Design a protein around this ligand. Structure first.
Ligand code: P8U
Lengths: 299, 301
């Protein structure tokens, strides 16, 4: 079987706390003796339209920030801002801090999201960083400060902290240095993203997964050159396929004995014609949020 | 705009161990001072055919079971079989035991699966129990003893433990009392699931979700009796509704003001007339793996 699968979230759950300033409550990430959270916690309703964050922050003191780990209040003993993230220093070290790192993820890569409300983990699911630097998440009021991450041999690599929803229903946020993915800004305004394109290497990986699990109706005897495929992909707002993508797809091609460029010819046929009302792995749409690595770690 | 979203898995990660008999290792669930696992851990390859589980267990002693949390051995001090699960009493109460209960779910209900290998969690994902009592998992060799669960507040309701794969590639297993869902047995034989059907109650929940988000073209000005709807539904390979299904749609019916039986009438028209190229929540396909609880969780909670 083949399933969209999130990393086990326990190591991140032990880091989630609630952060409150004024009438605004969201989540923070508590690592060692620092809590990281979105800086817009310091805004009021009036501030959010055009917040001068440095000016709003100079007027705050440590005691204006209320941090709670469950029933326990953590004393804030220091605070600073790094881009769009606030760093609150507390007197307590988190005993549950995992081995971790902060990474900035590349578009087309996937990560797990731990959606939290009031410092309490609520759900976990897989997202991809879109080419237009949005993510198609599930985030409601109070979800800010929820984080996205990957796990590699007990090391948690944090890559995303949640800040906002766009009018189209997609989501935007920062890495853990507080820099946004994409052209977005943490102010209460309607923001549009650039035109979103489809992650072609991931669509190919998912077709290979549909073949492994016995689904073949889309394949064909034909083939294509890399450049000719990429001309058709760009026409249909698919990202171009690089030679590294082809290389990355090697293991999957070998396992199924289907040349990458033969799978490209199949995808070309799908783009030009369609599904014909049919489905692949249950879906009526081409799925582009599985990476080659994601697929390999499942067959 | 809906994601299949699992529950946070940490409270279950803290209960996973491995159980080995000879060279056969699967996963177990450590709650208080008991470890629960599939009884077929006591089988060799040649026993799998039609194992004599009672005979195989009589040859076993406490000191034949290797239970490990990580690389740390947990001493077994008692063993018993309950249906298709082994219960291994150990000398240490799990300090990470959550508040928990053991529940038997119904077809259509969803749950999170924490897929594990050698006692180590690998991934978490949502499954729906199909009307034919299979789930569409992603289970590899060594995954048996992985569990499915829901979390309500801080209480973990364990509802599934994994035992086997069927010829068609779907998966089968038991509740935490060892009772299989559906008509399967833990023998290494080709077993067939009944033909699957569409989970009507979840499709209705999906229509309610569509209405909540302002997508309501399919609502009509008619109603139906539950029996009339069930007889039509069966002709389209949809499950009949139970009284419990009607009741668990109550909150969404109240939220939208659309009576359950009126929504049934709208669904009946979709089944008889098709979608006519229209879409619902952006798709021409009716989704059947979001329960009414799942819908409320992503729309309002
Ligand atoms: C933080 O918890 C919250 C998470 C959002 C709320 C609903 N779903 C989410 O993911 N983030 C916000 O509320 C940000 C805060 C600003 C200061 C960055 N703003 C936001 O998400 O607004 C939602 C945009 C649709 C709204 C616009 C409509 C037109 C007027 C301006 C807002």
């Amino acid at each position: 079987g083949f399933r969209k699968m999130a990393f086990p979230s326990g190591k991140v759950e032990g880091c989630m706390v609630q952060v409150t300033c004024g009438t605004t409550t969201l989540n923070g990430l508590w690592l060692d003796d620092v809590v990281y959270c979105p800086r817009h916690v310091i805004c009021t309703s009036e501030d959010m339209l055009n917040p001068n964050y440095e000016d709003l922050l100079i007027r705050k003191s440590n005691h204006n920030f209320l941090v709670q780990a469950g029933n326990v209040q953590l004393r804030v003993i220091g605070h600073s801002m790094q881009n769009c993230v606030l760093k609150l220093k507390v007197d307590t070290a988190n005993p549950k801090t995992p081995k971790y790192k902060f990474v900035r993820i590349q578009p087309g890569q996937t990560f797990s999201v731990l959606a939290c409300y009031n410092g309490s983990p609520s759900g976990v699911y897989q997202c991809a960083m879109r080419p237009n630097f949005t993510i198609k998440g599930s985030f409601l009021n109070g979800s800010c400060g929820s984080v996205g991450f990957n796990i590699d041999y007990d090391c948690v690599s944090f890559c995303y902290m949640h800040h906002m929803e766009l009018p189209t229903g997609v989501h935007a946020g920062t890495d853990l240095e507080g820099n946004f993915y994409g052209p977005f800004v943490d102010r209460q305004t309607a923001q549009a993203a650039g035109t979103d394109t489809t992650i072609t290497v991931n669509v190919l990986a998912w077709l290979y997964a549909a073949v492994i699990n016995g689904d073949r109706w889309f394949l064909n005897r034909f083939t294509t050159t890399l450049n000719d495929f990429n001309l058709v992909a760009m026409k249909y707002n698919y990202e171009p396929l690089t030679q590294d993508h082809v290389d990355i797809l090697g293991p999957l091609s070998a396992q199924t004995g289907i040349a990458v460029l033969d799978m490209c010819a199949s995808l070309k046929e799908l783009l030009q014609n369609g599904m014909n009302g049919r489905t692949i792995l249950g879906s009526a749409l081409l799925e582009d949020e599985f990476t080659p690595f994601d697929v390999v770690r499942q067959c």
